């Protein structure tokens, strides 16, 4: 009798909770702060003490790059957020598509040797999202704070030769909104101001169905303009920046990037899969992650992919309402199933076989 | 695996229907085959006998009011049953009211729906 813990580690936020819940009970920023002048603070606490700490993100574009700080994030997760003994719960952890083997092994070693977990399992974020949508076949477009991926999945398993990565995601859009607000005379530049602008972005932005036409209509009146109350009580007004900002998802050149937009990338991903399964991918384009939350995204993606795809294909973009946490929810469901007991790696297996066990078992 | 229902799966030609109930795969009473609760999700295995061998089609059926734990579990259990059958099953997603003719044709009396279902596991 033992409930698994579910931990979804993101570039921007950690989502954590207990298997069988419909949503993470703990969500906090993936930030570790250490004294500028000397051990560590994590999440919201770190941001409140930005004045005395150097703040770092241990996960970049979905990949762990600072293992010492990542262990601080996990210790914070177990001890300050969940108040769970890691040595007494199976843990399901998530990983990015194309996560390097060495990183998976290091995560496994830390769990079994630093946190002494009795059992663990590593799942691919996009696959958990597809399951959470009630599908075994589809292509997931997962866009978070640090990275976007398109992940074609057939009968339960990702097709690795067709996975695309696009480093453009929510933080780039936050930074781009900070940039274009200078047109109106705003200077948002500090770390704290960026958190403000992130919230403005989430509250006020939307994706235009046709960008060029939206630019023309927005110029004909002030109906585009919407306001936002800043912490200090001042009110900011935002106009066509509302849809110019997330337009960068479709036109990365707005950011000075040569990357293809998310519509082109989803199309290219589907094409890498053999012609006999593409119908089920085009018909099951599933959105995942916080940066897919913009109003208008499904209608825009449908129009743009329909234009790219063969005219005999049926395009269907699925936008689940809880898709901001669909990775976590998928992990919660998976780890609740009667059958999950035989999917995990036990510590005794790890002790006998070492961290490489993770590949044969996950 | 060790799940008792996996061990029964696909042994003989016929039709096997399970309902997702609180994150588990529970056999549907045979008397109720063909009548699906709109509040629930189900997994269906159709086994056909060929030139010696057996062929497998796995369908997961999603009622219009089933909860996300139920539809998600139906999808995952479908993958796991396929794996247990060495990947030889063909998987089919079946949505209430838009089911494939192959799925409908499993039921001599036709597909029927009923109100209600088992409570979500959330
Ligand atoms: N309603 C919203 N509209 C637009 N963007 C949003 C909304 N809600 C959240 N976001 C954005 O989604 C991002 C966080 O999403 P998510 O939690 O999926 O990412 P993550 O897992 O931390 O990062 P990654 O998956 O890139 O490693 C942030 O950029 C945030 O501003
Ligand atoms: Ca993520
Ligand atoms: Ca139900
Ligand atoms: Ca199969
Ligand atoms: Cl076309």
Residue numbers in the entry:
A (entry chain A): 5 to 42, 52 to 375
B (entry chain G): 3 to 52, 54 to 125
Give the exact sentences the study uses for this entry.
Gly115 in PfActI is located in the P loop of SD1 and is Thr, Ser, or Ala in other reference actins. We previously generated a mutant G115A that did not rescue long filament formation in the absence of jasplakinolide but showed slightly longer filaments than the wild type in its presence. We crystallized the mutant using the same conditions as the wild-type PfActI with either Ca2+ or Mg2+ to compare these structures. Unlike the wild type, the C terminus of G115A is more ordered, with interpretable electron density up to Cys375 in the Ca2+ and up to His372 in the Mg2+ structure. The G115A mutation straightens α3 and moves the P loop slightly away from the C terminus. This in turn favors a cation-π interaction between Lys114 and His372 (3.7 Å) and a hydrogen bond between Glu118 and His372 (2.8 Å). In the wild type, the position of Lys114 does not allow both interactions to take place simultaneously, which is the likely reason for the disordered C terminus. Trp357 and Phe353 are in a double conformation in both structures, the former facilitating a recently identified cation binding site. The conformations 1a and 1b of the A loop are evident in these structures, but conformation 2a is not visible in the Mg2+ structure.
